[PDB]
Structure formats: C-alpha cells, structure tokens
C-alpha cells in the first residue's frame, strides 16, 4: 500500500481523539447556561 | 364577408390597415396565433425568400471568383453540401444567428407592442420619407416577398426533379 503509514496514524485519531474531543466539547456546550 | 374568398366570412383578426391584406385566412390561422407574430414571420419569410430567389437567379448567371474550383457541377442546393464541408455555410450561419439574436430581442418588443412587425428602422437611403411612398413600398415588399416565397419553392423543386437550376431549366 502507498502511504501505508496513514491508517496507523489516522485511525486512532479519528476513532479515539476525534470522538473524545467532540464528546468533551459537546458536553460543555449542552451544559452551559449562557 | 371576405374579399379573396367570397363564400368564407372575413377573418376576424385581419384588418385592411395591415399590409398585403386580401382577407385571406380560410383556415382561421390568425385566430390561433398572435397576429403580430404571424406578421413578423411573414415579413421574415418574405425577405429571406427574396434573397433566396435572387440568389438562385444570380448563381445561375455568374459565379464569384474561385467558387468554380470549390464546387464544379452543383448549382442550387448541392453547393450547400460542398460549402458545409468548407466553412462558407457555417460562417453565414454564425452571422445570421448574430442578427437573429438581435431579432429575438426585436420580436420581444414587438410582442410588447413597442415595435411594428418587420420594422428594423433600416432605411439608410432615402426611400421612405413620404408616408405615401412608404405604404406603397410596404405593399410591394409584401407582394414581392410572397411571390419570392412561391418562386423559391418552384426553383428548388425544379432542381429536385431535374438538377438543372432555374434559368438552365428554362433553356433546356
């Protein structure tokens, strides 16, 4: 595979950090009074 | 009642003031379409047919320099095919399509009513400055144009049978 390193970089980020960040920031937005 | 067709009733949408009025509308086509549209269409068919008839006759009489080696035998409509392989017919198409884009606009204000049928204001030479000579020239344009439409049909159809072309068909 060409650029074979990309799945081992992008899959943990997309699968763990990306949801971990949207859940973290969505929680802040849904739990703020203003 | 109608002038041209005495048995038939006068066409409701047709009036004497309009050029080339003979009360001729047996099928009542003027009732179906807007009269200004038909009038512009008749004038346009007239002027193209006058050009076509004179073109048929002149192309019999003489030929412009060099056309004889582009096209040798073909006379009436055969030349059209030879010149589409060349670029002549395409060039004329492009420039008449330019003029007919502005004719599209012109017909739109005719249907808005601010322009008379066939009136392109193209009178460079002083031939319509009387409004009596103008009406006579208006009638002669319509009549010569109608005669030219029938003549263009007769010249091309004669070519379709014989291939002679108009004046050559006359001679033999």
């Amino acid at each position: 595979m060409t650029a074979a390193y990309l799945p081992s970089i992008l899959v943990p980020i997309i699968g763990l950090i990306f949801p971990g960040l949207v859940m973290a920031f969505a929680f802040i937005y849904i739990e703020q009074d203003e | 009642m109608s002038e041209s067709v005495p048995f038939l009733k006068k066409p409701e949408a047709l009036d004497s003031s309009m050029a080339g009025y003979a009360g001729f509308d047996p099928l009542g086509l003027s009732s179906i379409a807007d009269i200004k549209f038909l009038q512009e269409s008749e004038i346009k068919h007239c002027r193209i047919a006058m050009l076509a008839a004179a073109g048929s006759i002149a192309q019999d009489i003489f030929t412009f320099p060099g056309v004889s080696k582009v096209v040798g035998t073909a006379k009436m409509t055969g030349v059209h095919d030879v010149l589409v392989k060349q670029g002549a017919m395409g060039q004329i198409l492009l420039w008449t399509s330019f003029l007919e884009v502005f004719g599209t606009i012109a017909l739109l204000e005719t249907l808005d009513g601010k322009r008379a049928p066939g009136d392109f204001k193209f009178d460079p030479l002083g031939f319509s400055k009387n409004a009596e000579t103008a009406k006579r020239y208006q009638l002669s344009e319509i009549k010569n144009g109608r005669l030219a439409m029938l003549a263009t049909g007769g010249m091309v159809h004669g070519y379709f049978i014989t291939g002679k072309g108009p004046l050559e068909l006359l001679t033999n």
Binding site: - | E12, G28, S31, I32, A33
Partner: protein, 90 residues
C-alpha cells in the same frame, strides 16, 4: 401562507357548466367547433395512415410518417376541443 405566484395571464378556469369556457383551449379559444371537428377527423385519418405505414418499424423509417403518426393522439385532444366549442356556441 404567503401569496402563491402564477405566470402572468393566469385566469380562472374552474367550471361547473356543461362545458368549460373556451379559455381552457389557450391559443385555440377562437377556433370554431367545426374547425376542430374537421381537424379532429383529419388528424385521426392522417395520423392513423402514417402510423399504419410504419407498423413494421425498420432501421430506416420515413421521418414524415413518424412525425405524421403523432397526429393520432393529437386528434383525441382535437375532438375534446370540438365538443367544448360546440357546447359554448362556437
């Protein structure tokens, strides 16, 4: 809920009479019932004749007989217009 636009020249066409007003015929509102009825039969005969002449369809069909075959359904609309005009006194 907001004004619904229609093209200019929109007129009222709802009818509860025997026949619709001649306005439902558009550009043919002034044609007589005799003229539709004769056009209706003419379009039916010519359309059927042209249709009949090309029923075994070939790779070279006559284009006038194809175009002339469209007169058969067009005749159906013609006799409906003939019935409408006859019942409006035209």
């Amino acid at each position: 809920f907001s004004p619904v636009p229609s093209p200019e020249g929109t007129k009222e066409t709802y009818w509860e009479t025997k026949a619709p007003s001649s306005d439902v015929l558009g550009i043919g509102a002034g044609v007589s019932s005799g003229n539709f009825a004769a056009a209706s039969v003419f379009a039916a005969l010519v359309g059927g004749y042209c249709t009949g002449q090309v029923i075994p369809l070939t790779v070279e069909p006559n284009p006038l007989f194809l175009a002339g075959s469209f007169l058969l359904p067009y005749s159906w609309a013609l006799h409906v217009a003939a019935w409408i005009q006859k019942n409006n006194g035209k």
